[PDB]
Amino acid sequence: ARYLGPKLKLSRREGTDLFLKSGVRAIDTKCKIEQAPGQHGARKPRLSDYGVQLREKQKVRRIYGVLERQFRNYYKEAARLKGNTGENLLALLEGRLDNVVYRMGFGATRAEARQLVSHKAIMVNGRVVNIASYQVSPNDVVSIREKAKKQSRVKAALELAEQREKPTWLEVDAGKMEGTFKRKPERSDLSADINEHLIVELYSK
Amino acid sequence: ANIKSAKKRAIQSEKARKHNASRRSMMRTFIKKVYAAIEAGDKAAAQKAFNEMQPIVDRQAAKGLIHKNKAARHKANLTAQINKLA
Amino acid sequence: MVTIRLARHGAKKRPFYQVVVADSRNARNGRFIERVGFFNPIASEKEEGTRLDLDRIAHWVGQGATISDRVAALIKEVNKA
Amino acid sequence: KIRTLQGRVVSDKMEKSIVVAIERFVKHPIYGKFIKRTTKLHVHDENNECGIGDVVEIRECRPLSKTKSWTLVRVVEKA
RNA sequence: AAUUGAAGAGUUUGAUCAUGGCUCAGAUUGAACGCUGGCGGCAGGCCUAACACAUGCAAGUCGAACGGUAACAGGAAGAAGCUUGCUUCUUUGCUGACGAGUGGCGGACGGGUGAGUAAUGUCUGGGAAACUGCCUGAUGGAGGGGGAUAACUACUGGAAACGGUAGCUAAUACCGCAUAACGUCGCAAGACCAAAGAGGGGGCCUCUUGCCAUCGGAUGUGCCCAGAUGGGAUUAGCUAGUAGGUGGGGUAACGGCUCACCUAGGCGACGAUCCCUAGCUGGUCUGAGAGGAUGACCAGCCACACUGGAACUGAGACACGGUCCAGACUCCUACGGGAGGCAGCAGUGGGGAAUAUUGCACAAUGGGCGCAAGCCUGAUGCAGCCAUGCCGCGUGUAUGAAGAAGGCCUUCGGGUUGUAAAGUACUUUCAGCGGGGAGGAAGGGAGUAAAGUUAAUACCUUUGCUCAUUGACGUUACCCGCAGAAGAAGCACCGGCUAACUCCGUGCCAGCAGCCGCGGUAAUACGGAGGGUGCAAGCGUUAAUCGGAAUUACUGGGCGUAAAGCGCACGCAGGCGGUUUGUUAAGUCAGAUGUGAAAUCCCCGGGCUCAACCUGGGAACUGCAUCUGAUACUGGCAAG
Ligand SMILES: [Mg+2]
Ligand SMILES: [Mg+2]
Ligand SMILES: [Mg+2]
Ligand SMILES: [Mg+2]
Ligand SMILES: [Mg+2]
Ligand SMILES: [Mg+2]
Ligand SMILES: [Mg+2]
Ligand SMILES: [Mg+2]
Ligand SMILES: [Mg+2]
Ligand SMILES: [Mg+2]
Ligand SMILES: [Mg+2]
Ligand SMILES: [Mg+2]
Ligand SMILES: [Mg+2]
Ligand SMILES: [Mg+2]
Ligand SMILES: [Mg+2]
Ligand SMILES: [Mg+2]
Ligand SMILES: [Mg+2]
Ligand SMILES: [Mg+2]
Ligand SMILES: [Mg+2]
Ligand SMILES: [Mg+2]
Ligand SMILES: [Mg+2]
Ligand SMILES: [Mg+2]
Ligand SMILES: [Mg+2]
Ligand SMILES: [Mg+2]
Ligand SMILES: [Mg+2]
Ligand SMILES: [Mg+2]
Ligand SMILES: [Mg+2]
Ligand SMILES: [Mg+2]
């Protein structure tokens, strides 16, 4: 129900940084990021169009740490919701509580944010929520519980987030360890490297 | 019967069957008297038998042995037959 | 006869009652004539945990329908017991 | 109004009874073509007024025999 | 706001285009099997033998209808050891009560199953000739008598089951009589028809409740019609109560429902009859849709209750745990004769690829009886078992080059498994252990005060007010502490389709395989390994449905040569119909009204920490009927 294996294999297969490490070091100094894993990694056998769609889907899944059944349900919800299906899917993924905890800088990675959520360190609107997939809505306040404010993990994670592009759809107070989900991100707020139409097409087959 | 109330019900409905059968035989006998008098051609005897029967069918309808519609049917049929006779 | 009673819906350990008008011989969750409200015994604060169509209820009552004890208590409570 | 049906007498060989073919124009549920469909009704004809070929207006009534639950209203146009 | 909706690929050939079948990728399930398996929430769980069933339980209740008193728990009248307290007494329907019995109501519900049924069913919409316990509105009545009969007693028959005889006794059991219309019959005059008491209180009265009649309501049910609802024409004729009429009978009611007579009809290529199969619907799965497939759970309708048949009682049954008969089977027997029906809930055997506990509780909701208290309730609420599904979560999180050891490959340089381990620093969800602790408990019972009733401060009824209490689940949800990464990862695949490649082992063998195919020494296709890919507490396989299949083509295909124009023609039924005017308003179109159950789907919200689940309003239910309009087109009619 969670991927527990080596992390940089996933990035190396996707051929890009999935941000599955804290980012204290460059991912180059920890692995051969330009080479796919395994004995025949250096090879680069032509990828079919199906392969391209599959790899895009897997890359987004692995960024956010979502298994296939949950991800498929996300696609179904995005298709049901009014508007652009791929943008809806990205918005749903960004709304996850573990992802929001990471985006506010409380967790060094999304897996650390997930553990913070799971281990009951996170409050949404003053109430403990330990569900990683909980959907945060606009104007919600996400805070570190008082018992967890002394954790060195969280201070280090806030330091790390200081050295990333700050999301504009959130408002974090690193002193009180509180953040506000102002609005759902638009597509411009998310990376232009994600090609979500490929995921939509994959699931529409 | 396996259930106590079912055994009591069987006894009670047998008792009622005997009671009802006696009453129903009596009422049918009086109706048949009216019909026999009609067939013989005797109006006066037919009317006398009808006057005997009428309270009986009315009372048996009041007691639920027959529906009041059935008593009304017997009265109407016999009256129509008796009147169309002379 | 015609009764006004509670049909037990919802989920296990979390009952939700529909207030129905029914021939009393029918099953509790079966055939009914008209639904005239609901009662949520575990409704949260700010939630409307009871709604009754008192006009329809009075129409059926002035027409011979009896009222179960729970529904009678609910009618009294909609009128501030 | 009174609900009525109009149709062609196809048999009058019964005493006080006739058979009336009622015609309806219905769209086919699959192909969409409007097609003609016939309903045959045993109708009570007191006075034996109707002949084979007349067009009669009929109406529904209580059962009068095993197969009769319709009665004559009038002959709209005679044969 | 509530229709954001539509992908192909492989394979015929030396190659090509087309045609065309086969096959695959998807989604789904009451699944089963193999490998594996941590937790929880919610749901689901005999699809086969409508096979046979051990055992327990699934329908009672009312003493406020009645005679009563078996038992008890006492209040009285009379009684023995030997603790000066005391049993033990013995009696007594006096009292609370209550076994058996009469009586009332229930047992027609609830629950099960899908055998039968292709239309006495079901669905949608109309309808007329009906009955309807309990509930409810109105108006009146509610007098005065009688004969019994259980129980009980005595005797008596039978192994038993079950009876027989005689004598007592009661009623809200039963039956006359009276009374008798706005009831029934009758054109009318007339004639005729009912009933029951019981409880609480009181200086017979009053209150409550029950009883009878009639007409209403409501609910339920019976009946009728039209359209719809599988397959087969290598089933084309079927039918004599048959079709209709008249009269009698019959039913709650119309009706060949039945009978007598008369007429000779009735059904059928718009598919009758016959044969095969089948419970129907809301819906469910699939699909862009139109369709196709389907009817498990949930809800509506129907049918059935060992098999065949029958009626009785009753408001209601031709009656799952009633009666009678017959049959098969099982059992008891003293051999004469008797007993039984899990397709209620558990459960057993059996059949099967396969489907669970002989559990807890009436606390809640509902049902029966009761004035109530309450009793009953395998309905139901829960619990148990099972990864059967859906959903959620965990199995750690940082950091870590020594790019360690081993494995594997190697062109012998190295590459890879690799930040993966280890090491270091953290976090404790869930599981374990301790403590804390909601909500589903609304009522009901006692007193109390007012009314509101009366002769009455009384009974009783409504309100408030006080008291003490009511939870099966249950060691509940949930919350807080404790210890420590500890207790938690597998399954399929890697020739193309199709994401994922190499070495050794084998040598047309062993074997694989959905299709195309692979294997005969240099196999990414067999087998093991290393590496990898996809899913993940599951993963695969099989079965089965729709999709892809525009491959039955309505949407949406073809027929010169690929399969396909009858050898040719005439022609009935049928389909179709030049042009103008009038009329009609059937089709068609517009609006409205009724209906289209709820659930489900969809949209918007709301509740469970989220989700699944639950849930409030909407939309939708594309249909049908009716009414009112429109008149271009189609149809009818009239004139050209
Ligand atoms: Mg899961
Ligand atoms: Mg008929
Ligand atoms: Mg009586
Ligand atoms: Mg009298
Ligand atoms: Mg069958
Ligand atoms: Mg299609
Ligand atoms: Mg079907
Ligand atoms: Mg009867
Ligand atoms: Mg029964
Ligand atoms: Mg049984
Ligand atoms: Mg059973
Ligand atoms: Mg077996
Ligand atoms: Mg019992
Ligand atoms: Mg409580
Ligand atoms: Mg490939
Ligand atoms: Mg080899
Ligand atoms: Mg098709
Ligand atoms: Mg073709
Ligand atoms: Mg040829
Ligand atoms: Mg040819
Ligand atoms: Mg030719
Ligand atoms: Mg010709
Ligand atoms: Mg024309
Ligand atoms: Mg019209
Ligand atoms: Mg609906
Ligand atoms: Mg919410
Ligand atoms: Mg809704
Ligand atoms: Mg015209």
| Separation CA B80–CA D50 (nearest Å) | 33
Q: Are strands C2-11 and C34-39 parallel, antiparallel or unpaired?
A: unpaired
Please, which experimental method was used?
cryo-EM
Statement to judge: residues A79 and A21 lie in one domain: yes
- The answer to whether the C-beta of A192 is closer than 7 A to strand E is no
Kindly give, in sequence order, each residue whose CB lies less than 8 Å from that of residue B57, ignoring residues fewer than 6 positions away.
Answer: B27, B30, B31, B66, B70, B71, B74, B75
User: Tokens 């985006």, residue?
Assistant: A103
| Separation CA A103–CA A122 (nearest Å) | 14
Kindly give, in sequence order, each residue whose CB lies less than 8 Å from that of residue A110, ignoring residues fewer than 6 positions away.
Answer: A19, A20, A63, A64, A65, A98, A99, A102
Kindly give, in sequence order, each residue whose CB lies less than 8 Å from that of residue A76, ignoring residues fewer than 6 positions away.
Answer: none
CB atoms within 10 A of CB D17: 20
Q: Report the 3 state secondary structure along B31-82.
A: HHHHHHHHHHCCHHHHHHHHHHHHHHHHHHHHCCCCCHHHHHHHHHHHHHHH
Residue D61 region by backbone torsions, left for phi larger than 0, else alpha for psi between -120 and 50, else beta: beta
- A87, A93 Cβ separation under 8 angstroms: no
Kindly give, in sequence order, each residue whose CB lies less than 8 Å from that of residue A132, ignoring residues fewer than 6 positions away.
Answer: A96, A97, A98, A114, A117, A118
Chains that touch A (3 or more CB pairs under 8 A): none
Chains that touch C (3 or more CB pairs under 8 A): none
Residue C51: domain span: 1-81
Q: How far is the CA of B8 from the centre of ligand 11 (A)?
A: 28
Strand positions, DSSP E, D15-67: 17-27, 34-44, 55-60
Residue A185, in any domain of the structure: no
Sign of CA dihedral C62, C68, C69, C70: negative
Statement to judge: residues A65 and A109 lie in one domain: no
Q: How many helices and strands in chain A, by DSSP H and E?
A: 8, 5
Domain count, chain C: 1
- B46, B85 Cβ separation under 8 angstroms: yes
Residue A107: domain span: 94-180
Choose among D34, D75, D37, D68: nearest CA to D54: D75
For residue A78, which amino acid is it?
A
For residue A34, the domain's CATH number is 1.10.1050.10
| Separation CA A109–CA A21 (nearest Å) | 6
Kind plus residue range of the DSSP H or E element containing C23: strand C14-23
Statement to judge: residues A38 and A104 lie in one domain: no
Kindly give, in sequence order, each residue whose CB lies less than 8 Å from that of residue A61, ignoring residues fewer than 6 positions away.
Answer: A67, A68, A71
Choose among A184, A205, A193: nearest CA to A89: A184
Relative orientation angle of helices A152-162 and A110-118, to the nearest 10 degrees: 150
Q: Distance between terminal CA atoms of chain D?
A: 26
| Separation CA A199–CA A22 (nearest Å) | 27
Residue B73: domain span: 1-86
Domain count, chain A: 2
| Separation CA A78–CA A200 (nearest Å) | 10
| Separation CA B38–CA B48 (nearest Å) | 11
Return the SS3 of B22.
Answer: helix
| Separation CA C11–CA C45 (nearest Å) | 20
**Burial category of C49 from C-beta neighbours within 10 Å (exposed 0-12, middle 13-18, buried 19 and up):** middle
Kindly give, in sequence order, each residue whose CB lies less than 8 Å from that of residue B74, ignoring residues fewer than 6 positions away.
Answer: B31, B53, B57
CA B7 to C1' E154 (Å) is: 28
- D3, D60 Cβ separation under 8 angstroms: yes
Domain count, chain B: 1
Statement to judge: residues A168 and A115 lie in one domain: yes
For residue A151, the domain's CATH number is 3.10.290.10
Return the SS3 of D42.
Answer: strand
Bases on strand E under 7 Å from any protein CB: 4-7, 25, 38, 41-43, 59-61, 101-107, 109-111, 126-136, 174-177, 180, 183-186, 191-195, 212-214, 217-220, 223-228, 243-246, 248-257, 262-268, 270, 291, 298-301, 312-315, 319, 321-323, 340-341, 364-368, 379-383, 391-401, 403, 408-409, 415-421, 425-429, 439-444, 463-464, 479-481, 489, 497-502, 530-537, 554, 574-576, 586-588, 597-598, 602-604, 606-611, 613-617, 625-628
| Separation CA D52–CA D78 (nearest Å) | 10
